[PDB]
């Protein structure tokens, strides 16, 4: 048996993964996903993606879980920088553009995008931040363009020696080796607050059978046991909000 909320909206992952224009990594986008049902199997079975690193979850278990909110962050980077979109990584991108937390729960999804994102004379639309005094915090976004003072002399918004524009362009070109080609990245962030879950897989609810040994699934809590009526107050049915005691068996 399987008890999920009665959410029915489709989660708008299409306009994230399939958007025609992507953000620069220093200016990465975030789409907040809530109150909807997403079919992650479209994602974790697709052949479009070249990386699918999931932390704190296994990608194929994703159609049996629920979360409070999902965040979808997206941007473009070089190919050989994809490895830096990971917890604990260091470098220009992970320290100064997009940083993941210690305890990240989510998936990093990426695919080569040379056809869409490189131009013949170089696509200078896609930038990254090269200079910054301090590290970004996890999931922090800085889009400032103040001239970077590398020396003691103030810059007064005039760039010159020891006075650098903080952003640097990738200049993607079609003949670039694969590690210098642009990749589109989507980071899925599965958030689990103490609240009703609003983003679920597409698994269909069945009848709530009590008083009997059953394999169950309550918003992602999977066990084998007998659900009975419970006099405790504070697993709870999503649809009916009723408390159920669990006793094990086989």
């Amino acid at each position: 048996i399987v008890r999920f909320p009665n959410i029915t909206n489709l989660c708008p992952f299409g306009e994230v993964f399939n958007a025609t224009r992507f953000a620069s990594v220093y200016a990465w986008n975030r789409k907040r996903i809530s109150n909807c049902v997403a079919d992650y199997s479209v994602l974790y079975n697709s052949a479009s993606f070249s990386t699918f690193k999931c932390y704190g979850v296994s990608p194929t278990k994703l159609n049996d879980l629920c979360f409070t909110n999902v965040y979808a962050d997206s941007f473009v980077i070089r190919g050989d920088e994809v490895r830096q979109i990971a917890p604990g990584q260091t470098g220009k991108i992970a320290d100064y553009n997009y940083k993941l937390p210690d305890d990240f729960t989510g998936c990093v999804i990426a695919w080569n995008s040379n056809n869409l994102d490189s131009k013949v004379g170089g696509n200078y639309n896609y930038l990254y931040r090269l200079f910054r005094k301090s590290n970004l915090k996890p999931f922090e976004r800085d889009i400032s363009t103040e001239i970077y003072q590398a020396g003691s002399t103030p810059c007064n918004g005039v760039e010159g020696f020891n006075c650098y524009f903080p952003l640097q362009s990738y200049g993607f070109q079609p003949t670039n080796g694969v590690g210098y080609q642009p990749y589109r990245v989507v980071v899925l962030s599965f958030e689990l607050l103490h609240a009703p879950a609003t983003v679920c897989g597409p698994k269909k609810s069945t009848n709530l059978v009590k008083n009997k040994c059953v394999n169950f699934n309550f918003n992602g809590l999977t066990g084998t046991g007998v659900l009975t009526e419970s006099n405790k107050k504070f697993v709870r049915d999503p649809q009916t909000l009723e408390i159920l005691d669990i006793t094990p068996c086989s």
Partner: antibody
Amino acid sequence: QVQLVESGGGLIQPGGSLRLSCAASEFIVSSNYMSWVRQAPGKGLEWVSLLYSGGTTYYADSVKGRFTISRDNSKNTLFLQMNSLRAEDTAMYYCARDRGPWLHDYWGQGTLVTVSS
Amino acid sequence: DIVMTQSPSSLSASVGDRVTITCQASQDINKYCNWYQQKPGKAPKLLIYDASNLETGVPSRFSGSGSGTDFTFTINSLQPEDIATYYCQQYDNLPPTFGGGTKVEIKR
């Protein structure tokens, strides 16, 4: 007016420790990528280690776990802590400002480290 | 770990000659090849960053081209002040590595 002045070199016995420093003018060391590059007598160039403005460090495999890069913002000085020094660590040691990682656009005149008993 | 094979290791030319040095990277490094000039007892000086760009102050006689694996460094009319050892470097892929260097001597 920009300057990088290394000091602290000298003769030091194998297995011993040594700290190089590199005092800067006009560059703020804590606002720059800063590298150490070394040159063994009559030989080519070997990058040693790199300090990001934000504190990230990188080391050449041949010194990893033995050398440590650091700074003192007040003194506007970069350090290279050397431990368990070895014969083949003997070299002239340069500090350099990096206009972006490993883009060595300004080099000090170096300090000479001789590893011998 | 990228290897920078620099050619030739020594060169002997006359004032005003056109001196070409090449560097081949063992992997694609796009354009992230720099060129340094070292005079005896001095520290290296950056002359060309990003395969082809001239550091401010550097005479127009110096130039460079290339992208991918094959790089060229050129002194257009060699001068007395250009006696030095020249090194290429790839500075994008960890660890950065230098070529073996090219010792340049004036012919007389």
